[PDB]
Structure formats: C-alpha cells, structure tokens
Amino acid sequence: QSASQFTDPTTGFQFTGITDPVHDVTYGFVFPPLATSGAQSTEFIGEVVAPIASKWIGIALGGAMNNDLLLVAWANGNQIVSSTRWATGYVQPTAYTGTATLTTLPETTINSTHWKWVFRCQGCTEWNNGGGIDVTSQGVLAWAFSNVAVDDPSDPQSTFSEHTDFGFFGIDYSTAHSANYQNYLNGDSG
Amino acid sequence: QSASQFTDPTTGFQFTGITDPVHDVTYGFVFPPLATSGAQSTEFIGEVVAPIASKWIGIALGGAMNNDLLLVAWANGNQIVSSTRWATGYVQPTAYTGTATLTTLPETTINSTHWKWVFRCQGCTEWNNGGGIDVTSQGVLAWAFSNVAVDDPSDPQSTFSEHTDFGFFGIDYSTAHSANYQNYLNGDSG
Numbered sequence: 001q002s003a004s005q006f007t008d009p010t011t012g013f014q015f016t017g018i019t020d021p022v023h024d025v026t027y028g029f030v031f032p033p034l035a036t037s038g039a040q041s042t043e044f045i046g047e048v049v050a051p052i053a054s055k056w057i058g059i060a061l062g063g064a065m066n067n068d069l070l071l072v073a074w075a076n077g078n079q080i081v082s083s084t085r086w087a088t089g090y091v092q093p094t095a096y097t098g099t100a101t102l103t104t105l106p107e108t109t110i111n112s113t114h115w116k117w118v119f120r121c122q123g124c125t126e127w128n129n130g131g132g133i134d135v136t137s138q139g140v141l142a143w144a145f146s147n148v149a150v151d152d153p154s155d156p157q158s159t160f161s162e163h164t165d166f167g168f169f170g171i172d173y174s175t176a177h178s179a180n181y182q183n184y185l186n187g188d189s190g
Numbered sequence: 191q192s193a194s195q196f197t198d199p200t201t202g203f204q205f206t207g208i209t210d211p212v213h214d215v216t217y218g219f220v221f222p223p224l225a226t227s228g229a230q231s232t233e234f235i236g237e238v239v240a241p242i243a244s245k246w247i248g249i250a251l252g253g254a255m256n257n258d259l260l261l262v263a264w265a266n267g268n269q270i271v272s273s274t275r276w277a278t279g280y281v282q283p284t285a286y287t288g289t290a291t292l293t294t295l296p297e298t299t300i301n302s303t304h305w306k307w308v309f310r311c312q313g314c315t316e317w318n319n320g321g322g323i324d325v326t327s328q329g330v331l332a333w334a335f336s337n338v339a340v341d342d343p344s345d346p347q348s349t350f351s352e353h354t355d356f357g358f359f360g361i362d363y364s365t366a367h368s369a370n371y372q373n374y375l376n377g378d379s380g
C-alpha cells in the first residue's frame with residue numbers, strides 16, 4: 001500500500017499515512033521541518049485512529065517486526081496505555097532500552113466507538129542499535145493488529161498474543177514534514 | 191501491494207501474482223498470448239496455494255466485492271470445491287448468472303499442510319453486465335480469506351460467513367501473457 005497526505009478534521013493536523021480498510025484503522029505521521037544545516041530532528045508526531053474493537057495496535061517504524069523500534073498501544077478504559085518495544089526472532093517484543101520518549105498528546109480522544117491516540121515520539125528516528133529512519137528518503141512502515149485483549153491492560157509492559165493481522169505501506173518521508181509541527185506541539189493547527 | 195512474476199516450484203508454471211504474507215496464500219495468474227489482429231481471449235489460468243487453515247478463499251477479478259466476477263474455492267477432504275459468484279451489495283455472493291467455466295486442472299494438489307488449486311477460467315475476463323478486465327493494461331485484483339469453514343462444504347453454492355481478512359494488489363496484465371499457455375492446458379511446463 002502507499003501513504004498519502006490527509007488532514008485530521010477535528011484537530012486540523014496534517015499527516016502522511018493510510019487507513020487500513022479491513023480494520024478501518026488510520027495511521028498518520030508528521031515530521032518537523034527538514035534542516036538546512038546540521039542533523040535532522042529525531043522526533044515526529046503520529047496518530048492511530050482505531051475502532052474500539054481494536055484491542056491493541058503496533059507500529060513498526062522500520063517496517064519489519066525485528067531489529068527496529070516498535071510502538072504498541074491500546075485503550076484501557078478512558079486511557080491510552082503505550083510503550084516502546086523491540087523484537088528479535090518473532091517473539092514477544094520487550095521494553096526498548098534505547099533513547100525514545102513516547103508522549104500522549106492532549107488531542108488524544110477516546111469515545112464510545114473509537115480510540116484516537118495522538119502522540120509525540122522523541123528520539124524515535126535513530127535507535128540504539130545504530131539503525132533508524134532517513135527522514136529525507138522513501139521507506140516502509142508496518143502495522144500490527146489484534147482483536148484480542150492484552151494479558152494485563154493496565155501494564156504498559158503487558159505480554160499479549162501475536163497479532164491477528166499485519167500490513168505494510170510505503171512512505172515518502174521527504175514530503176511528510178510540516179511547517180506547523182511546532183504549532184501541533186502547542187495544540188495549534190495553525 | 192504489487193504483483194510480480196514467479197515460477198511454481200513444482201510444475202514450472204510461470205505466473206504473475208502475489209503471496210499474502212499474513213495468511214501465506216499465493217495467488218497466481220497467467221494469460222494466453224496477446225492478439226493484435228483479433229479480440230483478446232476471454233480465458234486465463236490461475237492458482238491458489240493455501241495453508242490448510244484457510245477454510246475458504248475468494249478472488250475478486252475486478253478488485254472489489256460488488257459488481258464483478260468472483261471466484262470462491264475451498265478444500266473439502268481430498269477435493270477442491272469451487273464456484274463463480276457475484277455480489278451486488280456487501281451480502282452473501284451468489285451463483286454468477288453469466289457464462290463462465292471454472293475447470294480444476296490436474297496440477298491441483300491437496301496434502302496435510304496445503305491445498306493448491308490450479309484452474310482454468312473460461313469466459314472470465316468479460317462479464318454479462320458488460321463489465322470485465324482489460325488484459326492489455328494495468329488493473330487491481332482483490333482476495334478474501336476466512337479461517338472458518340463454509341456452512342455446507344460439499345455444496346459449491348454453500349453459504350458462508352464474511353471473510354476475516356481481504357486485500358488488494360496491482361497487476362500489469364500486459365506482462366502476464368505467456369507463449370506456454372497452451373502447454374499449461376495440456377499439463378506441460380513447456
């Protein structure tokens with residue numbers, strides 16, 4: 001599949017991403033402006049908009065299960081529970097030990113039909129194994145879905161069973177940056 | 191997703207198609223030589239290679255559930271049961287009302303881990319509503335998966351419940367034609 005540009009109609013945040021038509025989950029990503037001098041930013045903002053039947057969602061930021069930073073999240077009542085994880089060998093991903101801070105942003109909304117997780121991921125483009133993503137280039141992201149609850153919903157490091165579905169999409173990171181990024185951080189669409 | 195060319199590692203048949211990594215089902219298509227002085231053939235040869243947990247598989251020849259020719263198949267014991275179907279509004283597809291002949295080819299196998307349906311589909315590129323596919327250009331195919339048995343597996347027109355997954359892939363039909371098509375019909379890889 002291929003990502004495209006879209007706007008969140010309630011927040012006005014502009015993302016790059018996709019909606020999976022099977023589970024009707026939307027994945028969106030937006031990056032701070034590219035730099036002219038120096039290193040690129042290592043953070044981005046993302047969103048997951050999922051029907052409540054979605055019991056947990058994962059994002060594989062290198063587009064594969066193993067050897068890349070994983071984001072996992074689920075609704076626990078009126079709360080989003082989330083973590084950064086890492087996997088080797090196709091087994092239960094465990095707590096990431098690198099430098100990454102996953103922040104739930106105030107736009108996050110949970111209602112009777114959907115959970116909408118809006119997050120900031122600082123340090124998430126470069127991982128402690130030396131890999132990461134090139135925000136000037138084209139790459140692949142992947143998502144993982146389950147309709148079965150995690151083993152302990154109040155624990156961010158809960159174990160859980162393998163996803164019931166997973167999928168991929170191409171993304172042109174060079175067109176995924178926004179001049180309004182800082183405004184998103186202040187809760188402004190611009 | 192995107193189709194590519196591949197070779198059946200048992201028969202040597204060359205197909206165009208994909209392997210869905212989630213359910214590990216391979217979908218393959220091959221067409222007769224392109225004509226330039228006549229209208230195109232309306233038939234093709236296809237294959238479904240599916241792990242036994244796949245209780246039914248559908249192929250949507252126009253890339254969508256409704257108003258296009260669908261192919262549905264499942265293993266019942268040591269035999270493949272299959273049908274041509276049609277749907278008008280996201281409900282149980284029923285028997286196609288046009289002229290189309292689905293023939294199981296002898297390369298078809300069923301064993302303990304997989305069922306492999308190799309078939310001939312005559313009258314399958316042009317449909318009795320005036321629609322169809324253009325085998326000289328680019329199009330989209332779709333598939334449907336379920337891991338729940340059909341209601342009555344010995345009946346080709348059995349009802350069943352909605353797929354648990356579905357997906358799409360782009361296919362360049364202009365690249366999917368083969369000089370070996372007639373050989374395939376005779377059971378030869380050529």
Ligand code: HEM
Pocket residue numbers: 057058059060063064065066070071072090091092093142143144160161162163166167211212213214
């Ligand atoms: C105990 C939990 C998990 C188990 C046992 C597990 C197991 C597996 C297995 C066996 C596969 C191969 C499937 C195939 O190709 O047929 C796979 C694929 C994959 N998994 Fe998981 N998984 C789990 C959690 C996760 C998480 C939480 C994520 C993302 C945050 C994820 C992302 C993926 C992706 C993207 C693939 C396909 C690409 C690749 O093969 O790496 N998995 N997983």
Ligand code: HEM
Pocket residue numbers: 021022023024247248249250253254255256260261262280281282283332333334350351352353356357
């Ligand atoms: C009793 C059986 C079936 C029911 C109730 C049914 C129902 C549905 C529904 C409700 C959707 C929309 C899902 C969404 O977008 O969230 C859908 C999509 C789809 N269905 Fe089915 N389905 C069934 C059988 C089949 C079969 C046999 C095929 C293929 C031979 C098929 C192919 C598709 C495809 C490819 C899509 C996605 C594209 C589209 O929206 O047209 N369906 N189906």
Ligand SMILES: *[C@@H]1O[C@H](CO)[C@@H](O[C@@H]2O[C@H](CO)[C@@H](O[C@@H]3O[C@H](CO)[C@@H](O)[C@H](O)[C@@H]3O)[C@H](O)[C@H]2NC(C)=O)[C@H](O)[C@H]1NC(C)=O
Pocket residue numbers: 009010049111112113114116
């Ligand atoms: C729970 O939250 C979800 C996600 O925010 C709500 O679905 C979203 O509802 C908005 C309506 O504010 C939809 O936005 C668009 O609104 C315009 C109105 O001009 C309309 O023209 C568009 O067709 C579209 O509806 C948005 O599409 C929709 N998103 C999804 C994924 O369904 C949902 O309504 C909330 N549920 C409750 C009970 O409040």
Ligand SMILES: *[C@@H]1O[C@H](CO)[C@@H](O[C@@H]2O[C@H](CO)[C@@H](O[C@@H]3O[C@H](CO)[C@@H](O)[C@H](O)[C@@H]3O)[C@H](O)[C@H]2NC(C)=O)[C@H](O)[C@H]1NC(C)=O
Pocket residue numbers: 199200239299300301302303304305306
């Ligand atoms: C049950 O049916 C399945 C599906 O046809 C069989 O799996 C397939 O078996 C072939 C034969 O060994 C596999 O071989 C491949 O062979 C080529 C030819 O040299 C080789 O280059 C490839 O690297 C590969 O090893 C084929 O991959 C495999 N396909 C799938 C989807 O599993 C299975 O062997 C059958 N079981 C029995 C007991 O007959």
